[PDB]
């Protein structure tokens, strides 16, 4: 499917996170595709995990 | 009452040209005349008040003058965003009255339209009517001929046109022609064609589709 500029931005953030491994990166991207209503929540958990793996 | 007679009805000029439009009071109104601009579906904008005074924030290319009962509005260097209706109004006596308006159009180089066609949506086709849309995009001049053919039969009486306001930047027009048929009739025929004749095209352009094609 296609995405608005907001969904694109969440994708971009998770794609660029330096401390995620690729299983985690793609898992979070998959969640963004799964449920757009959860974009903010998903991004927040991705950030927490990225920070904890610094 | 006092009537205000505006002239011309329509004036068309190139970007950078000086244009003058006029307004005549049926009797003395001293200098009690204002000019308004109206465009892009917006409210009237005051340009000039008391015949010759420029309202704050209005570009200096606008000016007004009076000679007896004759009032003029002049635009010294016409810009594309000046395409509009212009109205004069007197307040010398009650009722305050308006001129009937002058429309200013921008003259520019000829541009042939991009011609596109849209079959009825599957969503519309669930119920009983079919709308076919022919789109002519970003062309000049406004004059264009759009004819519908269904299985090569010329259609009449079942289409309507709409045209956009002259574009604020590139001074082009766009036009839609919509053919309306019953769903039953749409499903009975195969070839749907929009034929466009325009000065910018070396010969008429037909845009078409077969019902059912991807």
């Amino acid at each position: 499917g296609s995405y608005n500029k907001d969904q694109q931005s969440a994708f971009y953030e998770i794609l660029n996170m330096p401390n995620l491994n690729e299983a985690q990166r793609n898992g979070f991207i998959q969640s963004l595709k799964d449920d757009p209503s959860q974009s903010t929540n998903v991004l927040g958990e991705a950030k927490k995990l990225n920070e904890s793996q610094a | 009452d006092i009537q205000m007679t505006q002239s011309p009805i329509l004036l068309s000029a190139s970007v950078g040209d000086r244009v003058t439009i006029t307004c005549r009071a049926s009797q003395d109104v001293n200098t009690a005349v204002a000019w308004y601009q109206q465009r892009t579906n917006g409210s009237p904008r005051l340009l000039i008040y008391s015949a010759s005074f420029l309202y704050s924030g209005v570009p200096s290319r606008f000016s007004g003058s009076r000679s007896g009962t004759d009032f003029t509005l002049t635009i010294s260097s016409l810009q594309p965003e000046d395409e509009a209706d212009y109205y004069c109004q007197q307040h010398y006596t009650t009722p305050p009255t308006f001129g009937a308006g002058t429309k200013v159009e921008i003259k520019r180089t000829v541009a042939a339209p991009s011609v596109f066609i849209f079959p009825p949506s599957d969503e519309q086709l669930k119920s009983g009517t079919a709308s076919v849309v022919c789109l002519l995009n970003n062309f000049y001049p406004r004059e264009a001929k759009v004819q519908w053919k269904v299985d090569n039969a010329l259609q009449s009486g079942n289409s309507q046109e709409s045209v956009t306001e002259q574009d604020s930047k590139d001074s082009t027009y766009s036009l839609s022609s919509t053919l309306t048929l019953s769903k039953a009739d749409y499903e009975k025929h195969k070839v749907y064609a929009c034929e466009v004749t325009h000065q910018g095209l070396s010969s008429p352009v037909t845009k078409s589709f077969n019902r059912g094609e991807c």
Binding site: - | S43, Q89, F98, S114, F116, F118, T164, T178, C214
Partner: protein, 221 residues
């Protein structure tokens, strides 16, 4: 900033009544004249009435005298137009304006206008259909898509794209009255061909008179 905001316009039957309001801000209507001016669809401007709120002096166009009344409440900085015994020819956008503000003997500020429709016809919300981009709506690497907003009454409808984020290349056509007595229009937008399938395109359609709000996603067929 000086501002005037009209409200109250809507569909009314012939012989019916409507009340418009004109809310002023950024100045006091006690210091100016307030006018109502109307405009029939596709026609010129016509003065309707005026009031000087400081002393309540009023004047009317002959065509509305006795049927319309203008008034003001300086405590609410608002003017009003009561419209009774309405007729088809009263159909128009009604603007309020000020005159004499800051010493300017002209109408220097106007509201956005409110539409009054006098008709026996009933309110009807639009159907919103996709105009899907296809091989038949693309050339030169750009593609046209849109929404058909069909069969509504009365005017107006508004259309935006992607909640106002998409404005370039948009053409929203003037509504046209169909033989059915219902309005229809299309709004189209031209975008890069390469963006189809990756960028979401949604037309946001609002028909306030029927409380119809539709967000229609438009994608390739």
């Amino acid at each position: 900033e000086v501002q005037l905001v009209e409200s109250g316009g809507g569909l009314v039957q012939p012989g019916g009544s409507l009340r418009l309001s004109c809310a002023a801000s950024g100045f006091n209507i006690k210091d100016t004249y307030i006018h109502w001016v109307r405009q029939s669809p596709g026609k010129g401007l016509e003065w309707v009435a005026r009031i000087y709120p400081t002393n309540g002096y009023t004047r009317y166009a002959d065509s509305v005298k006795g049927r319309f009344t203008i008034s003001a409440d300086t405590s609410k900085n608002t003017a009003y137009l009561q419209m009774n015994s309405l007729r088809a020819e009263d159909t128009a956008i009604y603007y309020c304006s000020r005159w004499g503000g800051d010493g300017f003997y002209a109408m220097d500020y106007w509201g956005q206008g409110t539409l009054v429709t006098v008709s026996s016809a009933s309110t009807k919300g639009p159907s919103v259909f996709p105009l899907a981009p296809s091989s038949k709506s693309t050339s030169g690497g750009t593609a046209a898509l849109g929404c058909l907003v069909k069969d509504y009454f009365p005017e107006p409808v508004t259309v935006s794209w992607n909640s106002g984020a998409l404005t370039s290349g948009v053409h929203t056509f003037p509504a046209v009255l169909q033989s059915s007595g219902l309005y229809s229009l299309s709004s189209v937008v031209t975008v890069p061909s390469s963006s189809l399938g990756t960028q979401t395109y949604i037309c946001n359609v609002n028909h306030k008179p029927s409380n119809t709000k539709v967000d229609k996603k438009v994608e390739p067929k």
